Amino acid sequence: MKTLSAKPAEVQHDWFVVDATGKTLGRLATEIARRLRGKHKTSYTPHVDTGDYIIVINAEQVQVTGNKALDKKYYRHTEFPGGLKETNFEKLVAHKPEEIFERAVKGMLPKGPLGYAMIKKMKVYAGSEHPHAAQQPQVLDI
Amino acid sequence: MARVKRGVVAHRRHKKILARAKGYYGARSRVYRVAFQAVIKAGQYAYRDRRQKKRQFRALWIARINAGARQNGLSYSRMIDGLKKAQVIIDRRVLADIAMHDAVAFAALAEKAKGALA
Amino acid sequence: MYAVIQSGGKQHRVVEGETLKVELLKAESGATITFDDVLMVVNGDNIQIGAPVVAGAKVTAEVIGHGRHDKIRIIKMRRRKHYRKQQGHRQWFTELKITGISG
Amino acid sequence: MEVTAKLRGAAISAQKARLVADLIRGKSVAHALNILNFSNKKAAVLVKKALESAIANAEHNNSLDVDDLKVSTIYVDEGMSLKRIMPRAKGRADRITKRTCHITVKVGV
Amino acid sequence: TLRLNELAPAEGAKREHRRLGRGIGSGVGKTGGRGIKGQKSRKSGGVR
RNA sequence: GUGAGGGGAGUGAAAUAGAUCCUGAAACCGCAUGCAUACAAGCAGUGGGAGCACCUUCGUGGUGUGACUGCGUACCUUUUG
RNA sequence: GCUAAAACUAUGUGCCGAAGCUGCGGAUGUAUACUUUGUAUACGUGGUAGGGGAGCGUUCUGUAAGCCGAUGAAGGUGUGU
Ligand SMILES: [Mg+2]
Ligand SMILES: [Mg+2]
Ligand SMILES: [Mg+2]
Ligand SMILES: [Mg+2]
Ligand SMILES: [Mg+2]
Ligand SMILES: [Mg+2]
Ligand SMILES: [Mg+2]
Ligand SMILES: [Mg+2]
Ligand SMILES: [Mg+2]
Ligand SMILES: [Mg+2]
Ligand SMILES: [Mg+2]
Ligand SMILES: [Mg+2]
Ligand SMILES: [Mg+2]
Ligand SMILES: [Mg+2]
């Protein structure tokens, strides 16, 4: 009919690079999730992926407020009896910052095949260097 | 006389339900008892969805208009107010179509809305 | 060049030569219908956004005919309450061909 | 132009016969004959009989050349079932079904 | 007029007899107007 | 296998009228073609919707299929439920 | 996930939001007007046990020594409307 949905073949995916130094995790993750889902484009379609690629550098410099550095705890469960594993943000940001960003953005993306497709477009690196110079990403601040 | 055999009419009635149950999985397209329930539930779902569709499409139009307005440096909520104060009566469906297919016209509408707001 | 018109309680964006279906009208087949309340006219780079309407803008169309949409079934059933009801429906429509747009 | 042979009333279940039928579906006549010859299944004998009847028909009635013939179509269908009664413990009785199948073989060039 | 296939009774002189227990649409299906359970719902359920 | 069964020929208006033989529905079981399906969690549909195959009066057309997506816990009885 | 909050208190502008209301097209009950008698106006049309009204299909009897049928009936299977 007259309201047309975006065709996946016709979608273009740009590449942006973001520095995470001295930024709040949640308020950065909201913008990251928005851009990954594609809400910023006027051709937004709920059943199609129209987002852009987002590279995150300096991930270990991400900050939290209050006492959350010591008090925010991350959990997982091995399906063995009594197998609950428990850690802290201070240790997790030192060990696997990519896990920090992955959890933060997964919590905000939809839960399904399309959400799994969208999350693959986020690239997270601890250092200030990334291996995608061939894609010529543009600087984006959010 | 007045002894009535029922096979022909019963067969016709069952065949109509089976024909309406085309495409369903397993017994839902083969067994009359299962097929009959499937058709009624499909009717109920269709009755509810004829109402749900308007809500979903209005939400889609609002999302597209919001994207266009923020691209032009304004929010959806303020753009609606600006257009209403400018006395423009273009509806959300047409606004979303313009946002999707013609950036210059939507920019003109946004300029008019912000001018009315000022 | 495209224009925005109103018909049957709804708005439509149309171009020259477009065939569309609207709520049933009382005009006869082959008749000419003029929409003098045009909300928007866009021609390449000239954009007119009539506040209620664009002054002087008119869109002319020809009435191809009238018809009915495909049948729809209405079903209502309240489980365990011995209540069922059903009904069919076919909506009327008028077919229009846009023959002219003027700002 | 594929000739047919049909064997009806074979004393074996279609489920068992269809394994052997699948083993040879689509292959050339000579290779299928080798496989049937060296199979140890009971259904292999019946499938061999039907296939040889089909080849003989192809030769005698249609003047086809056996060298160029292949197993183009083959399928097995369920047949009439015999009914018997099996005594069980404590006086309970059981129904027994003895199944039958039909074998259709088509050979063409 | 005056034919074996052109004769009809006066309006309202005939009505259809009520048939119980023949579906939801009829309006008297299932219980057939007897209500739910009790003495009067049974066959020959009236008291003297 | 001098078997059962079938393929030709012939008869017959008709042989999927061939002897558990008029018509020959459904459950149930095969074969062939088109599309989909091996990173994804639930009454199996419904409202949207890309792609593919064929037909096509070549289209705002028709017929099959249905990636992805919002919503959604069968029916009947008896019950305060 | 959130800390000059995305928390709490007070104030003010906008906006979203239902099968509620409005817009457009269609059906139906009652009452009132026409007697140019089925056309308008007004108000209504969630519903179990129940009550009331109006209909569709099937077998046979008359109409029927009629009408259809070997140039194809009933039955079966698709398609369109
Ligand atoms: Mg079927
Ligand atoms: Mg609504
Ligand atoms: Mg004994
Ligand atoms: Mg009742
Ligand atoms: Mg009872
Ligand atoms: Mg009682
Ligand atoms: Mg009694
Ligand atoms: Mg027969
Ligand atoms: Mg896959
Ligand atoms: Mg995964
Ligand atoms: Mg009760
Ligand atoms: Mg109880
Ligand atoms: Mg209402
Ligand atoms: Mg009612």
Side-chain angles (χ1 to χ4, degrees), chain E residues 4-40:
Chain E
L4 274 173
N5 59 331
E6 296 171 334
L7 278 173
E11 196 284 332
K14 303 289 168 69
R15 319 209 65 210
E16 294 294 328
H17 69 123
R18 183 177 292 171
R19 284 194 285 124
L20 302 179
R22 292 299 188 278
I24 293 177
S26 55
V28 288
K30 191 196 182 176
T31 43
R34 290 173 169 271
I36 311 178
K37 286 177 166 188
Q39 188 166 22
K40 294 151 76 178

Side-chain angles (χ1 to χ4, degrees), chain C residues 8-72:
Chain C
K10 288 155 279 275
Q11 297 174 15
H12 308 78
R13 195 161 73 94
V14 309
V15 303
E16 289 212 272
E18 175 161 14
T19 300
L20 73 164
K21 286 204 184 88
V22 297
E23 284 295 4
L24 176 70
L25 291 172
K26 296 280 199 68
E28 293 292 328
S29 67
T32 186
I33 302 299
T34 63
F35 301 85
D36 299 15
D37 51 356
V38 193
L39 316 183
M40 204 189 202
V41 171
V42 181
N43 174 11
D45 60 356
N46 176 4
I47 296 163
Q48 308 179 72
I49 303 156
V53 305
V54 179
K58 65 178 72 66
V59 172
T60 65
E62 175 185 320
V63 180
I64 305 298
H66 317 279
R68 302 192 88 194
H69 288 303
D70 284 320
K71 188 184 288 292
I72 291 157

Side-chain angles (χ1 to χ4, degrees), chain D residues 53-103:
Chain D
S53 174
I55 299 153
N57 298 344
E59 190 277 331
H60 180 74
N61 300 317
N62 310 67
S63 168
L64 296 201
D65 179 5
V66 64
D67 297 312
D68 296 331
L69 296 170
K70 291 177 70 68
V71 170
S72 65
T73 302
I74 192 161
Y75 47 75
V76 188
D77 279 311
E78 293 179 353
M80 194 181 66
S81 283
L82 283 179
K83 303 295 161 77
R84 301 292 187 270
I85 298 304
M86 185 64 72
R88 297 311 287 258
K90 287 165 195 248
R92 183 179 63 83
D94 279 358
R95 297 216 271 290
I96 297 298
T97 299
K98 299 181 80 71
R99 298 170 181 283
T100 300
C101 75
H102 309 308
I103 307 167

Side-chain angles (χ1 to χ4, degrees), chain B residues 17-18 20-46, chain C residues 75 77:
Chain B
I17 301 300
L18 277 169
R20 286 170 71 199
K22 278 216 199 154
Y24 298 165
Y25 172 64
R28 288 156 169 288
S29 77
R30 292 165 180 88
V31 178
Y32 172 81
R33 286 183 197 241
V34 183
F36 181 76
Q37 303 181 196
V39 176
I40 305 299
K41 180 57 67 73
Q44 300 168 289
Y45 279 145
Chain C
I75 296 90
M77 183 278 288

